[PDB]
Scaffold this active site. Structure first.
Site, PDB file in Angstrom:
ATOM      1  N   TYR A  73      70.219 102.972  -2.710  1.00  0.00           N
ATOM      2  CA  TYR A  73      69.481 103.145  -3.692  1.00  0.00           C
ATOM      3  C   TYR A  73      68.467 102.368  -4.073  1.00  0.00           C
ATOM      4  O   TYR A  73      67.669 102.567  -4.763  1.00  0.00           O
ATOM      5  CB  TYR A  73      70.463 103.508  -4.745  1.00  0.00           C
ATOM      6  CG  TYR A  73      71.061 104.766  -4.926  1.00  0.00           C
ATOM      7  CD1 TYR A  73      70.692 105.946  -5.635  1.00  0.00           C
ATOM      8  CD2 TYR A  73      72.363 105.012  -4.324  1.00  0.00           C
ATOM      9  CE1 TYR A  73      71.325 107.097  -5.418  1.00  0.00           C
ATOM     10  CE2 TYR A  73      72.959 106.180  -4.127  1.00  0.00           C
ATOM     11  CZ  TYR A  73      72.396 107.156  -4.984  1.00  0.00           C
ATOM     12  OH  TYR A  73      72.943 108.533  -5.030  1.00  0.00           O
ATOM     13  N   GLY A  86      65.312 101.054  -3.691  1.00  0.00           N
ATOM     14  CA  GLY A  86      64.107 101.565  -2.945  1.00  0.00           C
ATOM     15  C   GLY A  86      63.737 102.632  -3.920  1.00  0.00           C
ATOM     16  O   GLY A  86      64.233 102.797  -5.239  1.00  0.00           O
ATOM     17  N   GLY A 104      64.079 107.194  -4.399  1.00  0.00           N
ATOM     18  CA  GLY A 104      64.825 108.288  -4.112  1.00  0.00           C
ATOM     19  C   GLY A 104      66.303 107.918  -4.491  1.00  0.00           C
ATOM     20  O   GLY A 104      66.909 108.357  -5.390  1.00  0.00           O
ATOM     21  N   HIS A 125      70.467 101.795 -12.256  1.00  0.00           N
ATOM     22  CA  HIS A 125      69.240 101.809 -12.830  1.00  0.00           C
ATOM     23  C   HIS A 125      68.355 103.219 -12.751  1.00  0.00           C
ATOM     24  O   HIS A 125      67.615 103.695 -13.523  1.00  0.00           O
ATOM     25  CB  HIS A 125      68.374 100.686 -12.027  1.00  0.00           C
ATOM     26  CG  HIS A 125      66.859 100.580 -12.441  1.00  0.00           C
ATOM     27  ND1 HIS A 125      65.820 101.117 -11.809  1.00  0.00           N
ATOM     28  CD2 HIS A 125      66.256  99.921 -13.292  1.00  0.00           C
ATOM     29  CE1 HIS A 125      64.930 100.826 -12.233  1.00  0.00           C
ATOM     30  NE2 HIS A 125      64.909  99.993 -13.261  1.00  0.00           N
ATOM     31  N   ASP A 126      68.548 103.750 -11.544  1.00  0.00           N
ATOM     32  CA  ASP A 126      68.141 105.081 -11.218  1.00  0.00           C
ATOM     33  C   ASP A 126      68.643 106.203 -12.197  1.00  0.00           C
ATOM     34  O   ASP A 126      67.759 106.903 -12.694  1.00  0.00           O
ATOM     35  CB  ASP A 126      68.594 105.709  -9.850  1.00  0.00           C
ATOM     36  CG  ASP A 126      68.004 106.801  -9.487  1.00  0.00           C
ATOM     37  OD1 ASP A 126      66.896 107.175  -9.569  1.00  0.00           O
ATOM     38  OD2 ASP A 126      68.914 107.778  -8.994  1.00  0.00           O
ATOM     39  N   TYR A 169      66.633 105.524 -15.510  1.00  0.00           N
ATOM     40  CA  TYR A 169      65.483 106.195 -15.555  1.00  0.00           C
ATOM     41  C   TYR A 169      65.660 107.618 -16.065  1.00  0.00           C
ATOM     42  O   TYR A 169      64.959 108.300 -16.613  1.00  0.00           O
ATOM     43  CB  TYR A 169      64.796 105.730 -14.186  1.00  0.00           C
ATOM     44  CG  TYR A 169      63.930 104.783 -14.188  1.00  0.00           C
ATOM     45  CD1 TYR A 169      64.242 103.575 -15.193  1.00  0.00           C
ATOM     46  CD2 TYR A 169      62.810 104.441 -13.374  1.00  0.00           C
ATOM     47  CE1 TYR A 169      63.598 102.344 -15.123  1.00  0.00           C
ATOM     48  CE2 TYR A 169      61.893 103.434 -13.256  1.00  0.00           C
ATOM     49  CZ  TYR A 169      62.556 102.347 -14.205  1.00  0.00           C
ATOM     50  OH  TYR A 169      61.584 101.012 -14.056  1.00  0.00           O
ATOM     51  N   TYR A 210      55.102  98.384 -19.730  1.00  0.00           N
ATOM     52  CA  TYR A 210      55.525  97.907 -20.993  1.00  0.00           C
ATOM     53  C   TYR A 210      55.261  96.462 -21.263  1.00  0.00           C
ATOM     54  O   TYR A 210      54.518  95.837 -20.362  1.00  0.00           O
ATOM     55  CB  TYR A 210      57.044  97.970 -21.084  1.00  0.00           C
ATOM     56  CG  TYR A 210      57.897  97.433 -19.913  1.00  0.00           C
ATOM     57  CD1 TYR A 210      57.917  96.417 -19.761  1.00  0.00           C
ATOM     58  CD2 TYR A 210      58.506  98.246 -18.982  1.00  0.00           C
ATOM     59  CE1 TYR A 210      58.561  95.683 -18.551  1.00  0.00           C
ATOM     60  CE2 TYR A 210      59.305  98.022 -18.018  1.00  0.00           C
ATOM     61  CZ  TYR A 210      59.162  96.446 -17.612  1.00  0.00           C
ATOM     62  OH  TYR A 210      59.779  96.136 -16.367  1.00  0.00           O
ATOM     63  N   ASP A 229      64.982  98.022 -16.904  1.00  0.00           N
ATOM     64  CA  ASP A 229      64.615  97.196 -16.018  1.00  0.00           C
ATOM     65  C   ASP A 229      65.416  95.705 -16.317  1.00  0.00           C
ATOM     66  O   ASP A 229      65.887  95.207 -15.153  1.00  0.00           O
ATOM     67  CB  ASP A 229      63.164  96.823 -15.782  1.00  0.00           C
ATOM     68  CG  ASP A 229      62.240  98.266 -15.555  1.00  0.00           C
ATOM     69  OD1 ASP A 229      60.897  97.746 -15.234  1.00  0.00           O
ATOM     70  OD2 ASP A 229      62.848  99.164 -15.025  1.00  0.00           O
TER      71      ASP A 229
HETATM   72  C1  LIG Z   1      67.398  91.002  -6.443  1.00  0.00           C
HETATM   73  C2  LIG Z   1      67.419  91.426  -4.930  1.00  0.00           C
HETATM   74  C3  LIG Z   1      67.732  89.979  -4.183  1.00  0.00           C
HETATM   75  C4  LIG Z   1      69.153  89.353  -3.593  1.00  0.00           C
HETATM   76  C5  LIG Z   1      69.538  87.979  -3.863  1.00  0.00           C
HETATM   77  O1  LIG Z   1      68.719  86.924  -3.475  1.00  0.00           O
HETATM   78  N1  LIG Z   1      70.602  87.564  -4.186  1.00  0.00           N
HETATM   79  C6  LIG Z   1      70.992  86.230  -4.669  1.00  0.00           C
HETATM   80  C7  LIG Z   1      72.382  86.171  -5.162  1.00  0.00           C
HETATM   81  S1  LIG Z   1      72.917  84.792  -5.630  1.00  0.00           S
HETATM   82  O2  LIG Z   1      72.070  84.117  -6.377  1.00  0.00           O
HETATM   83  O3  LIG Z   1      73.096  84.256  -4.110  1.00  0.00           O
HETATM   84  O4  LIG Z   1      74.070  85.130  -6.228  1.00  0.00           O
HETATM   85  C8  LIG Z   1      66.542  92.386  -4.008  1.00  0.00           C
HETATM   86  C9  LIG Z   1      67.377  92.913  -2.669  1.00  0.00           C
HETATM   87  C10 LIG Z   1      66.400  94.147  -2.050  1.00  0.00           C
HETATM   88  C11 LIG Z   1      65.216  94.406  -3.294  1.00  0.00           C
HETATM   89  C12 LIG Z   1      64.689  95.743  -3.820  1.00  0.00           C
HETATM   90  C13 LIG Z   1      64.047  96.281  -2.440  1.00  0.00           C
HETATM   91  O5  LIG Z   1      62.998  95.184  -1.958  1.00  0.00           O
HETATM   92  C14 LIG Z   1      63.323  97.799  -2.567  1.00  0.00           C
HETATM   93  C15 LIG Z   1      62.388  97.897  -3.974  1.00  0.00           C
HETATM   94  C16 LIG Z   1      61.049  97.021  -3.691  1.00  0.00           C
HETATM   95  C17 LIG Z   1      60.236  97.220  -5.097  1.00  0.00           C
HETATM   96  O6  LIG Z   1      58.764  96.141  -4.916  1.00  0.00           O
HETATM   97  C18 LIG Z   1      60.857  96.607  -6.203  1.00  0.00           C
HETATM   98  C19 LIG Z   1      62.120  97.423  -6.622  1.00  0.00           C
HETATM   99  C20 LIG Z   1      63.227  97.448  -5.215  1.00  0.00           C
HETATM  100  C21 LIG Z   1      64.266  98.341  -5.750  1.00  0.00           C
HETATM  101  C22 LIG Z   1      63.800  95.715  -4.934  1.00  0.00           C
HETATM  102  C23 LIG Z   1      64.615  95.270  -6.231  1.00  0.00           C
HETATM  103  C24 LIG Z   1      65.013  93.839  -5.677  1.00  0.00           C
HETATM  104  C25 LIG Z   1      66.197  93.876  -4.580  1.00  0.00           C
HETATM  105  C26 LIG Z   1      67.594  94.743  -5.238  1.00  0.00           C
HETATM  106 CA   LIG Z   2      52.849 101.600 -21.426  1.00  0.00          CA
END
Ligand SMILES: C[C@H](CCC(=O)NCCS(=O)(=O)O)[C@H]1CC[C@H]2[C@@H]3[C@H](O)C[C@@H]4C[C@H](O)CC[C@]4(C)[C@H]3CC[C@]12C
Ligand SMILES: [Ca+2]
Length: 124
Positions: free
Chosen positions: A28, A30, A32, A48-49, A52, A73, A99
Site C-alpha cells: 500500500y 505508494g 493504488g 491512510h488510503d 482518503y 492544505y 496525512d
Molecule cells: C516513513 C517511511 C520511512 C522508514 C523509517 O525510516 N523508519 C524508521 C523507524 S525508526 O525511527 O527506526 O523506528 C517511508 C518508507 C517508504 C515511504 C513511502 C514510499 O517512498 C512511497 C511513497 C513516495 C511519496 O513521495 C510519498 C508517499 C509514499 C507512500 C512514502 C511515505 C513514506 C515511507 C512509508
Molecule cells: Ca487547498
C-alpha cells in the site's frame, strides 16, 4: 497535497528524506494498493488510503479528479511536532489530519528493508 505529505513526514522523521525515493513499500505504500498490508508500516499506508477514501465519500467534498493527494492544505512543523492549521477548510482539514496521523504512524512502525519495491503483482 502529496508534496506536503512528504514534507510532513520528514518533520516527524528527520532521517527519512532518502526513503520517499522513486521506490515504493509493501502493498500500500505508494499509489493504488491491493491485497493485504505486509506489516505495520504498510498497514499505516493502508489506513491512510482508507482515510482518503472516507474523505472522497464526504458529500460536501469534491477533489480534483477525485484524488485527495491534489488537495493542498496549510500546516506547520515545530520539533517533529505536526500541527494542522485551523484555517484549513473542512475538506482540507480532513486530508491534513489523515496525512498527520499517517506521519505519526510511520514514525512508530519498524522499517523492513525486504519490502522496499515489493513485487506487488506477486505478493499483494
Ligand atoms: C516513513 C517511511 C520511512 C522508514 C523509517 O525510516 N523508519 C524508521 C523507524 S525508526 O525511527 O527506526 O523506528 C517511508 C518508507 C517508504 C515511504 C513511502 C514510499 O517512498 C512511497 C511513497 C513516495 C511519496 O513521495 C510519498 C508517499 C509514499 C507512500 C512514502 C511515505 C513514506 C515511507 C512509508
Ligand atoms: Ca487547498
Amino acid at each position: 497535497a502529496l508534496w506536503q505529505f512528504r514534507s510532513m513526514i520528514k518533520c516527524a522523521i528527520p532521517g527519512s528524506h532518502p526513503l520517499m525515493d522513486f521506490n515504493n513499500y509493501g502493498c500500500y505504500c505508494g499509489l493504488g494498493g491491493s491485497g493485504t498490508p505486509v506489516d505495520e508500516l504498510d498497514r499505516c499506508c493502508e489506513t491512510h488510503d482508507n482515510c482518503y477514501r472516507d474523505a472522497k465519500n464526504l458529500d460536501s467534498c469534491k477533489f480534483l479528479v477525485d484524488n485527495p493527494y491534489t488537495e493542498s492544505y496549510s500546516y506547520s512543523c515545530s520539533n517533529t511536532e505536526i500541527t494542522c492549521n485551523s484555517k484549513n477548510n473542512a475538506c482540507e482539514a480532513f486530508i491534513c489530519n489523515c496525512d498527520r496521523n499517517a506521519a505519526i504512524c510511520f514514525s512508530k512502525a519498524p522499517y523492513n528493508k525486504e519490502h522496499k519495491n515489493l513485487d506487488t503483482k506477486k505478493y499483494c
